[PDB]
Amino acid sequence: RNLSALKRHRQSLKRRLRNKAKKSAIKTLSKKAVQLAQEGKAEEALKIMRKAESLIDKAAKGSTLHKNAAARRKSRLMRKVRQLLEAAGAPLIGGGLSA
Amino acid sequence: PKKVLTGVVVSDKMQKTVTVLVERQFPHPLYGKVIKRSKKYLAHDPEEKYKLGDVVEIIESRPISKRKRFRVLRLVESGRMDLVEKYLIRRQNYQSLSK
Amino acid sequence: MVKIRLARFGSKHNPHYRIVVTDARRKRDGKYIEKIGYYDPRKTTPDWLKVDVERARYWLSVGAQPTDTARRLLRQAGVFRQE
Amino acid sequence: GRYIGPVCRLCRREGVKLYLKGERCYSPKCAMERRPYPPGQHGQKRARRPSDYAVRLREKQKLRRIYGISERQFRNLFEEASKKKGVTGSVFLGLLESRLDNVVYRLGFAVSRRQARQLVRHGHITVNGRRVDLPSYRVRPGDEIAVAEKSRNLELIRQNLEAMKGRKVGPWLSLDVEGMKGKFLRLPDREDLALPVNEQLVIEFYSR
RNA sequence: GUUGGAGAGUUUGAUCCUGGCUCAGGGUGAACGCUGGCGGCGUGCCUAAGACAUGCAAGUCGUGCGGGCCGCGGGGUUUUACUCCGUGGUCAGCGGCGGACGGGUGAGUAACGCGUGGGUGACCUACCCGGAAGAGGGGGACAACCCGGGGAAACUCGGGCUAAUCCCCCAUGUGGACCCGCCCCUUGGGGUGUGUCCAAAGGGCUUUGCCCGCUUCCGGAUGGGCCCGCGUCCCAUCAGCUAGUUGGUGGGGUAAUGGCCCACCAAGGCGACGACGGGUAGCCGGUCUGAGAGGAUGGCCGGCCACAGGGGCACUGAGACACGGGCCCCACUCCUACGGGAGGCAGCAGUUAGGAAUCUUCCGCAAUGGGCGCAAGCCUGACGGAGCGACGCCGCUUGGAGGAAGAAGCCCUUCGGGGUGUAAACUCCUGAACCCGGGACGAAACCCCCGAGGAGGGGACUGACGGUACCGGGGUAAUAGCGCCGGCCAACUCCGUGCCAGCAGCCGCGGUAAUACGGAGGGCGCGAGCGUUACCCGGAUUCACUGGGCGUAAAGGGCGUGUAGGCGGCCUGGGGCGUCCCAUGUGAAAG
Ligand code: SF4
Ligand SMILES: [Mg+2]
Ligand SMILES: [Mg+2]
Ligand SMILES: [Mg+2]
Ligand SMILES: [Mg+2]
Ligand SMILES: [Mg+2]
Ligand SMILES: [Mg+2]
Ligand SMILES: [Mg+2]
Ligand SMILES: [Mg+2]
Ligand SMILES: [Mg+2]
Ligand SMILES: [Mg+2]
Numbered sequence A: 001r002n003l004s005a006l007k008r009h010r011q012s013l014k015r016r017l018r019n020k021a022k023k024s025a026i027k028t029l030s031k032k033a034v035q036l037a038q039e040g041k042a043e044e045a046l047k048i049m050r051k052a053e054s055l056i057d058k059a060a061k062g063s064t065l066h067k068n069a070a071a072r073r074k075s076r077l078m079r080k081v082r083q084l085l086e087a088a089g090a091p092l093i094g095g096g097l098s099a
Numbered sequence B: 001p002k003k004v005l006t007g008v009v010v011s012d013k014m015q016k017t018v019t020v021l022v023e024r025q026f027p028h029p030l031y032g033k034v035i036k037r038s039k040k041y042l043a044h045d046p047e048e049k050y051k052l053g054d055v056v057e058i059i060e061s062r063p064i065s066k067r068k069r070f071r072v073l074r075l076v077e078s079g080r081m082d083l084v085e086k087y088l089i090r091r092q093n094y095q096s097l098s099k
Numbered sequence C: 001m002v003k004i005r006l007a008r009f010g011s012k013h014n015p016h017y018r019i020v021v022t023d024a025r026r027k028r029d030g031k032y033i034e035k036i037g038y039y040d041p042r043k044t045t046p047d048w049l050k051v052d053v054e055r056a057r058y059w060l061s062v063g064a065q066p067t068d069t070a071r072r073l074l075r076q077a078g079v080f081r082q083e
Numbered sequence D: 001g002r003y004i005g006p007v008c009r010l011c012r013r014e015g016v017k018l019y020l021k022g023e024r025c026y027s028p029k030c031a032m033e034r035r036p037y038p039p040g041q042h043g044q045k046r047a048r049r050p051s052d053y054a055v056r057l058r059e060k061q062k063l064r065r066i067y068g069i070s071e072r073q074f075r076n077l078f079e080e081a082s083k084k085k086g087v088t089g090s091v092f093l094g095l096l097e098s099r100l101d102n103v104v105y106r107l108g109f110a111v112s113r114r115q116a117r118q119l120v121r122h123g124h125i126t127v128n129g130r131r132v133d134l135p136s137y138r139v140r141p142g143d144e145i146a147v148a149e150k151s152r153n154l155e156l157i158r159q160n161l162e163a164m165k166g167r168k169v170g171p172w173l174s175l176d177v178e179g180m181k182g183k184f185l186r187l188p189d190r191e192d193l194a195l196p197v198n199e200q201l202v203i204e205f206y207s208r
Numbered sequence E: 001g002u003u004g005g006a007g008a009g010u011u012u013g014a015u016c017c018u019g020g021c022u023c024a025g026g027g028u029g030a031a032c033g034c035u036g037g038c039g040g041c042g043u044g045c046c047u048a049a050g051a052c053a054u055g056c057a058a059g060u061c062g063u064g065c066g067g068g069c070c071g072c073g074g075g076g077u078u079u080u081a082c083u084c085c086g087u088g089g090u091c092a093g094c095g096g097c098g099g100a101c102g103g104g105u106g107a108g109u110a111a112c113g114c115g116u117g118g119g120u121g122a123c124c125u126a127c128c129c130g131g132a133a134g135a136g137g138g139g140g141a142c143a144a145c146c147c148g149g150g151g152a153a154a155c156u157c158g159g160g161c162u163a164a165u166c167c168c169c170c171a172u173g174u175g176g177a178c179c180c181g182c183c184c185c186u187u188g189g190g191g192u193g194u195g196u197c198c199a200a201a202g203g204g205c206u207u208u209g210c211c212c213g214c215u216u217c218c219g220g221a222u223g224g225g226c227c228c229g230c231g232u233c234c235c236a237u238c239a240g241c242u243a244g245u246u247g248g249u250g251g252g253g254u255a256a257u258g259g260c261c262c263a264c265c266a267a268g269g270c271g272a273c274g275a276c277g278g279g280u281a282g283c284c285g286g287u288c289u290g291a292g293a294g295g296a297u298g299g300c301c302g303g304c305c306a307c308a309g310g311g312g313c314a315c316u317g318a319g320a321c322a323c324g325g326g327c328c329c330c331a332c333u334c335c336u337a338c339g340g341g342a343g344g345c346a347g348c349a350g351u352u353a354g355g356a357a358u359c360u361u362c363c364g365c366a367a368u369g370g371g372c373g374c375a376a377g378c379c380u381g382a383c384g385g386a387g388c389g390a391c392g393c394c395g396c397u398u399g400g401a402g403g404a405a406g407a408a409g410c411c412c413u414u415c416g417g418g419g420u421g422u423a424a425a426c427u428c429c430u431g432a433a434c435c436c437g438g439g440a441c442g443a444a445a446c447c448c449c450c451g452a453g454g455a456g457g458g459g460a461c462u463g464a465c466g467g468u469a470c471c472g473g474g475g476u477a478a479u480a481g482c483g484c485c486g487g488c489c490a491a492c493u494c495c496g497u498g499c500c501a502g503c504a505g506c507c508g509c510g511g512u513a514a515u516a517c518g519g520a521g522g523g524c525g526c527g528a529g530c531g532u533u534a535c536c537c538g539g540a541u542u543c544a545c546u547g548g549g550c551g552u553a554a555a556g557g558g559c560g561u562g563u564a565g566g567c568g569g570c571c572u573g574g575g576g577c578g579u580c581c582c583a584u585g586u587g588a589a590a591g
């Protein structure tokens, strides 16, 4: 009586739930480095982008955070840590920051 | 063709923004007379040196605000306040239709 | 993709197709890009099949794969002859 | 489809000998050469002034009845003449004689267009070797009008084919008796076919 | 071989003028009245975006993966049972691609919605094509299935396994992305340096090869998002509207600019060139009229928009805020075993209600087209076809010739005759319908062979329309109706009627001897149609741009002053805004 191709909903929901995960994982994660970059440290902070960045890209392998939307976060996030760090610190350990 | 337009200002009263008033002159599609039609544009003056009386040029530019999609281009002449009157007086003729 | 399909016209009981290119998701008789020849299967004329064999190789190069009743026509006109 | 009614009334009503019957037409028993006045009771009674709209209707009816045709085709095959370049009044007289049911009459295969149309419609006349059973066939130049060989032996055609033998065919046709084929040469002018029609009136009619 | 313009009746004793009303014309997605034959092509719910029974319209892939199930061949512990290998088909499931195209509607929208021209240094595009470089290892998940439990179905829960083009990590890095500087145009474009980050799938066959896939990157084509100048209905009896409003700083957000969202600042924004509000309405190419200018219309063909009972909502994907996907509130409806469930024809038919009115619950993928697997092939109410309806256009038939100084009946009269009238009957001539025999075009490719899965060539299966069209032969004269007859307006007499019955679009006619009413005879116009009504344009130079007026006909403000606006004497020079000329692009197709 109905379209057996309603299966796409199943595929949709597990895709959705398998999207909210990693996308939100970028959030709280990159919400951790900023405070750390604000509250001072860099070793245990510039180490975080290192993985944060790696995840954004990994989201871009699939249909989650796709496109150059990473290049919206991967650009505006490592845009602040710099300015964050000269506020007591100066760009410290050899992480993702060029010079 | 990014539509260059030339027109007299009307205000210098907002930050980085002015009010170019340009004039269009054309016939009447029904009557052979050649009539005037005018329109007000809002422009982008980041130097804040385009001021009142300045007869300037504007261009179809990238969106800057809601009603601000044109940039200022260059200057033609500054000593033109007698036209601003014709705006200052018209809108003050608008005064006398009330209670 | 983009197709080299046909567009049927003419009176009923007189199919007159236009060897044409639309986008794939387009109606049979819509805003095509390029007509490249007429086609009648009922054989009313001696010149009953024109084909831009040079302009075809445009869209054939830029990526336009056609249908059975479209590939054979380019052969009947000789687009694949080049040797 | 056609008139199918009383014919001699037409000829009396328009005060002109409409040659529609056939052999009786030129005979001394042509109703006009018997009763030359409009029919129906008030014939001999004094006919008052023709209203300025009248005389332009009647000539229009003359031609209409001369060729045996309705008034949609008459109009539609008149619209074309008005649009088609040239003098409006005689292009119209061109696309008329081009009609198949006329030509056969002009070819003397029949003495009457009304007679001719039947022969056309019945599968007897042939154009370029094809069984054309259409009266309203715009005969184009260089066409082969002939009696179908499958029916070129009836007891009607020969009598009326013989009846022509050496008749002065229209100065625009080519008749071959026994060969039974008649080729459409050029195309007519009013000066080539003189009729009692001020065709300009039909214009002035169809402009009111 | 395209070209364009007609007026008339009506006020008065009578005339001229202004002036209005009415008519003849063309068109219809029309209906209705009376008739009614055939075929070709089209077209067919404007009304209630109201409610829908039922059937059908969105699937495809074993050359991706695992499994239940049925046939066929092989089997195993020597063994029942059973279990297994291979091949075909079917059921479903994980997975990939398609359900964002197709098809319907016109509620909404007075808006960058549409049309036109541009911009994008502000972006997107899977399947297509072209070029460069690659696929080395390891881990795992959830359904299908098994067990159990519940419900009438809907369905759902709890436990336990597992494969893969599924998930995840590491390895390399053609190359892409990012922060910070540097080389050139300039809005985020183009390189480069150091640092950081990012890849991968297998399946098959004729395996030392080929087809189909995968991953990163650049480019083309197509298809989109957005911004802008310009034109787009009425009401001035709507004269003020504005607190995200208007600009900015900064952050967010998306593929991208944005006052799209939020925080702080300064008061700014719009309007008589008509802001705000009200009413109507989808827009265009086109269509109808008009000589033109103009006026009205956008059904069906095609382009764009918006909607899928009303409304909001986000997910999935490259793409929707998605008609036949999901969620939630409202209203409606349907189902039952009463605990509870479900549904959305403005998709093809078809029903109901509303109406003056609107199609068969048909056939087939043969064709074109679309989606899937390479491929055979599946699906395709898109479509191609037929079915209904004189709704429109066109074509065609109800016979042709001969035939009476003129049968019959009917009509008129002055009784002598005159009309229907070649009209009828009659002779001949062909033969719509009918009958038989043949029988299509639309249909040559996907497939197979040779050939390299190339080029090229050879071979073969396939039709709903339809035994239709058509063709060959035979063979009967065989439906005609409607309006009008006072002027406009073509077409006349008799009878009855006697301000009654009635006709009538304007004038008007009928008040006894009617060419207007009712009937006949006859005549005029059309003809398988004819008339009525409604609407659009015209006629209406009667909103006057072409193309009008204001002494007495409707019309000069009661006068003055004056802002905005409109308009402006003579001469010279400049810029060339309007203006004019040439080229080029666009102006899609259909019209
Ligand atoms: S010419 Fe013929 S049609 Fe004319 S009236 Fe005489 S017979 Fe009758
Ligand atoms: Mg304006
Ligand atoms: Mg001229
Ligand atoms: Mg831009
Ligand atoms: Mg592009
Ligand atoms: Mg401002
Ligand atoms: Mg509306
Ligand atoms: Mg539906
Ligand atoms: Mg939820
Ligand atoms: Mg098919
Ligand atoms: Mg018909």
Ligand SMILES: [Mg+2]
Pocket: E489
């Ligand atoms: Mg008339």
Ligand SMILES: [Mg+2]
Pocket: E498, E499, E511
């Ligand atoms: Mg009386």
Ligand SMILES: [Mg+2]
Pocket: E544, E547
């Ligand atoms: Mg004027």
Ligand SMILES: [Mg+2]
Pocket: none
């Ligand atoms: Mg007076």
Ligand SMILES: [Mg+2]
Pocket: E557
């Ligand atoms: Mg006044």
Ligand SMILES: [Mg+2]
Pocket: none
């Ligand atoms: Mg052009």
